[PDB]
RNA sequence: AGUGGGUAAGAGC
């Protein structure tokens, strides 16, 4: 079942843990994705 | 044997060859000579 | 950031309290289950 | 002197009872769960 | 006289402690007149286990030693070896150390 | 407690010790109403039948039978004595008092091990047996 | 700071 589910992408990327990242790498990737959002650390116009 | 009284003038400490012990001096009454 | 390539954010890490509790519980059950157990087994469990 | 006397007024009962039991003719001398059952 | 009573009480306490020491006819624990208890010889390990006294006994021994020190300071002052100032200093040193 | 046999006078205790030629006699010295004695009683009753082959259990109330209190130092709330062929057997439990088990043991497996080790050591003619489990530390953590 | 948790058992003289 897992071989099939990886053959045809039944599980979208957000499903974790994947066979590519250890959980600490998952945390690092989450932090990096949060940081890499376009103008995520903006508070001049009150966005949160 | 259960249900039988002790013989008169018998020391249960004796009659068996038993010997006591003294782990310390704080326990037990003072030995009398 | 993947565009500015600058230090936009700072990430401070910490070990979760649940993880510390789990580790303490593991060490406690290693120790308390050592009445009849070789020293090498205890040291290997602690090392692991 | 007074500090040690005030220690003595409280330490006296312990030694008194201990020696009274010790010098007496006859010497005298994990339970939470296994209490009710 | 108070010094007489102190000497009498020191002697009586020594006698009581000696009676307690020789409780099971174990006569190898020598207690001196300054309330220092020591084995008379190299006692065997069986004897050393058999000659264990609780914390209460040693507390009593040391408190009687303290009273012995006080009464001995008074006796030394009465004899004339130490002045009244020296007696007071000795008593203060006893009660501080 | 009440299930196990009870000895009422010191002569009965002597007869019980003498009459056993090939079984270790385990005697609980204490008071039936003592909670620690209650733990010893319940453990012994739990394993009174498992070790019937090579042991026997007797209960003695030191208030009604004080005849050993001086000689056996029967002043702890509960003590356990092991005898083999009219000879008291010592156990190097690790607590510094090899003469008796003066504390309550929760595990019945530990007491079965103690009885079996006592039987093995005393059958070989030895008078002191080394306990299978150390008891200088309660292993609480 | 501190006591311990350090008793080999056995044979009769």
From Swiss-Prot, chain A:
Report which residue ranges the record marks as coiled coil.
Answer: none
Q: Which domain of life is it from?
A: Eukaryota
Tissue specificity field: Widely expressed.
Report the subcellular localization.
Nucleus; Nucleus speckle
Reported disease = Retinitis pigmentosa 13: A retinal dystrophy belonging to the group of pigmentary retinopathies. Retinitis pigmentosa is characterized by retinal pigment deposits visible on fundus examination and primary loss of rod photoreceptor cells followed by secondary loss of cone photoreceptors. Patients typically have night vision blindness and loss of midperipheral visual field. As their condition progresses, they lose their far peripheral visual field and eventually central vision as well.
Query: What job does this protein perform?
Result: Plays a role in pre-mRNA splicing as core component of precatalytic, catalytic and postcatalytic spliceosomal complexes, both of the predominant U2-type spliceosome and the minor U12-type spliceosome. Functions as a scaffold that mediates the ordered assembly of spliceosomal proteins and snRNAs. Required for the assembly of the U4/U6-U5 tri-snRNP complex, a building block of the spliceosome. Functions as a scaffold that positions spliceosomal U2, U5 and U6 snRNAs at splice sites on pre-mRNA substrates, so that splicing can occur. Interacts with both the 5' and the 3' splice site.
Q: What is stated about domains?
A: The MPN (JAB/Mov34) domain mediates interaction with TSSC4 and SNRNP200. Has structural similarity with deubiquitinating enzymes, but lacks the residues that would bind the catalytic metal ion. Contains a region with structural similarity to reverse transcriptase, presenting the classical thumb, fingers and palm architecture, but lacks enzyme activity, since the essential metal-binding residues are not conserved.
The molecule here is called Pre-mRNA-processing-splicing factor 8
What does the record give as the organism's lineage? Eukaryota, Metazoa, Chordata, Craniata, Vertebrata
From Swiss-Prot, chain B:
Q: How is it modified after translation?
A: Phosphorylated by PRP4K during spliceosome assembly.
- Disease tied to this entry: Retinitis pigmentosa 60: A retinal dystrophy belonging to the group of pigmentary retinopathies. Retinitis pigmentosa is characterized by retinal pigment deposits visible on fundus examination and primary loss of rod photoreceptor cells followed by secondary loss of cone photoreceptors. Patients typically have night vision blindness and loss of midperipheral visual field. As their condition progresses, they lose their far peripheral visual field and eventually central vision as well.
Subunit record text: Identified in the spliceosome B complex. Identified in the spliceosome C complex. Associates with the U5 snRNP particle. Component of the U4/U6-U5 tri-snRNP complex composed of the U4, U6 and U5 snRNAs and at least PRPF3, PRPF4, PRPF6, PRPF8, PRPF31, SNRNP200, TXNL4A, SNRNP40, DDX23, CD2BP2, PPIH, SNU13, EFTUD2, SART1 and USP39, LSm proteins LSm2-8 and Sm proteins. Interacts with ARAF. Interacts with AR and NR3C1, but not ESR1, independently of the presence of hormones. Interacts with USH1G.
Which stretch of the full sequence is covered here?
8 to 40 of 941
Tissue specificity, in the record's words, reads: Widely expressed.
Which gene does this sequence derive from?
A: PRPF6
Job description of the protein: Involved in pre-mRNA splicing as component of the U4/U6-U5 tri-snRNP complex, one of the building blocks of the spliceosome. Enhances dihydrotestosterone-induced transactivation activity of AR, as well as dexamethasone-induced transactivation activity of NR3C1, but does not affect estrogen-induced transactivation.
| Species whose genome carries this gene | Homo sapiens (Human)
Q: Where in the cell is it found?
A: Nucleus, Nucleoplasm; Nucleus speckle
This chain belongs to which protein, by name?
A: Pre-mRNA-processing factor 6
Top-level taxonomic group: Eukaryota
Curated annotation (Swiss-Prot), chain F:
Compartments, as annotated in UniProt: Nucleus
The superkingdom listed in its UniProt entry is Eukaryota
Chief location category: nucleus
Q: Name one GO cellular component term.
A: cytosol
UniProt cross-references to CDD domains, sorted A to Z: DIM1 (cd02954)
Reproduce the UniProt comment on modification after translation: The disulfide bond seen in structures determined by X-ray crystallography and NMR is not essential for protein folding and function.
Task: Describe the protein's quaternary organization and the partners it interacts with.
Answer: Component of the precatalytic spliceosome (spliceosome B complex). Component of the U5 snRNP complex. Component of the U4/U6-U5 tri-snRNP complex. The U4/U6-U5 tri-snRNP complex is a building block of the precatalytic spliceosome (spliceosome B complex). The U4/U6-U5 tri-snRNP complex is composed of the U4, U6 and U5 snRNAs and at least PRPF3, PRPF4, PRPF6, PRPF8, PRPF31, SNRNP200, TXNL4A, SNRNP40, SNRPB, SNRPD1, SNRPD2, SNRPD3, SNRPE, SNRPF, SNRPG, DDX23, CD2BP2, PPIH, SNU13, EFTUD2, SART1 and USP39, plus LSM2, LSM3, LSM4, LSM5, LSM6, LSM7 and LSM8. Directly interacts with CD2BP2.
Family classification:
Belongs to the DIM1 family.
Q: Tell me, what does this protein do in biology? A: Plays a role in pre-mRNA splicing as component of the U5 snRNP and U4/U6-U5 tri-snRNP complexes that are involved in spliceosome assembly, and as component of the precatalytic spliceosome (spliceosome B complex).
> Can you say what this protein is called?
Thioredoxin-like protein 4A
The record lists the organism as: Homo sapiens
């Amino acid at each position: 079942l897992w071989y099939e589910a990886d053959k045809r992408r039944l599980f979208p990327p957000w499903i974790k843990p994947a066979d590519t990242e250890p959980p600490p790498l998952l945390v690092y990737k989450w932090c990096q994705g949060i940081n890499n959002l376009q103008d995520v650390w903006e508070t001049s116009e009150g966005e949160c | 044997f259960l249900g039988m009284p002790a013989p008169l003038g018998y020391v249960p400490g004796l009659g068996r060859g038993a010997t006591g012990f003294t782990t310390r001096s704080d326990i037990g009454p003072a030995r009398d000579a | 950031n993947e565009v500015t390539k600058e230090r936009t954010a700072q990430c401070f890490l910490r070990v979760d309290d649940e993880s510390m509790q789990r580790f303490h519980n593991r060490v406690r059950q290693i120790l308390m289950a050592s009445g009849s157990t070789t020293f090498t087994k205890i040291v290997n469990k602690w090392n692991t | 002197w007074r500090v040690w006397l005030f220690f003595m007024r409280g330490i006296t009962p312990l030694l008194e009872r201990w020696l009274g039991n010790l010098l007496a003719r006859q010497f005298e001398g994990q339970r939470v769960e296994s209490h009710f059952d | 006289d108070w010094v007489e009573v102190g000497l009498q009480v020191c002697r009586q306490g020594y006698n009581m402690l000696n009676l307690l020491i020789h409780r099971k006819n174990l006569n190898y624990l020598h207690l001196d007149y300054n309330f220092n208890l020591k084995p008379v010889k190299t006692l065997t390990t069986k004897e050393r286990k058999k000659s264990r006294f609780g914390n209460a006994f040693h507390l009593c021994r040391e408190v009687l030693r303290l009273t012995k020190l006080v009464v001995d300071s008074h006796v030394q002052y009465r004899l004339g070896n130490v002045d009244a100032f020296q007696l007071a200093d000795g008593l203060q040193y006893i009660f501080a150390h | 407690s009440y299930m196990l046999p009870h000895l009422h006078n010191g002569w009965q205790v002597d007869q019980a010790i003498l009459s056993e030629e090939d079984r270790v006699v385990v005697i609980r010295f204490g008071h039936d109403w003592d909670p620690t004695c209650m733990k010893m009683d319940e453990v012994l009753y739990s394993i009174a039948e498992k070790v019937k082959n090579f042991a026997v259990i007797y209960l003695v109330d030191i208030t009604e039978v004080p005849d050993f209190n001086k000689m056996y130092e029967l002043y702890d709330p509960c003590t356990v004595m092991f005898f083999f062929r009219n000879k008291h057997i010592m156990i190097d439990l690790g607590t510094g008092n090899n003469n008796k088990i003066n504390w309550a043991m929760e595990d019945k497996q530990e007491m079965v091990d103690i009885i079996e080790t006592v039987y093995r050591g005393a059958r070989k003619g030895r008078g002191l047996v080394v306990s299978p489990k150390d008891y200088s530390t309660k292993y609480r953590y």
